[PDB]
From a paper:
N4-like phages have a genome size of about 75 kb, nearly twice that of T7, and encode around 70–90 ORFs, including a characteristic large virion-associated RNA polymerase (vRNAP) unique to this family of bacterial viruses. The massive 3,500-residue vRNAP 18,19, present in 4 ± 1 copies inside the mature virion 20, is ejected into the host upon infection. In stark contrast to the N4 transcriptional program, which has been studied extensively 17, many key questions about the role of phage N4 vRNAP as an ejection protein and its part in the DNA ejectosome remain unanswered. vRNAP (gp50) consists of three predicted domains: a likely membrane-spanning N-terminal domain (NTD), a single-subunit RNA polymerase (RNAP) domain, and a large C-terminal domain of unknown function (CTD). In this study, we use a complementary top-down and bottom-up approach by determining the cryo-EM structures of both the full-length recombinantly expressed vRNAP and the fully asymmetric N4 virion tail.
Author numbering:
A (entry chain PB), B (entry chain PA): 612 to 662
The structure:
């Protein structure tokens, strides 16, 4: 019978959750990019108004 | 019969979604670049006005 390694099964679980956070990583930065761009839209909208 | 690995099928699914976010990644940054450039257009338009 194979005797599973307590270290090995621990790391493999963490790598599974690691991939999930690496994916939530991008989603968070999508919300950051579009917020910055849409903010720059607002600060150029009033700049034309002063023109 | 092949016995699919619960870890393997989990990661392969995440890699599929990973590629999709890596693609939405670019689209978000396109919206950031053109917002910055068009904002710089506005802040040079009024600069000529002061001239």
């Amino acid at each position: 019978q194979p005797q599973p390694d307590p270290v090995q099964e621990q790391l493999k679980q963490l790598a599974v959750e690691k991939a999930q956070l690496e994916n939530e990583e991008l989603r968070s930065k999508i919300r950051l990019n579009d917020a910055q761009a849409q903010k720059a839209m607002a600060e150029r909208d009033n700049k034309n108004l002063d023109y």
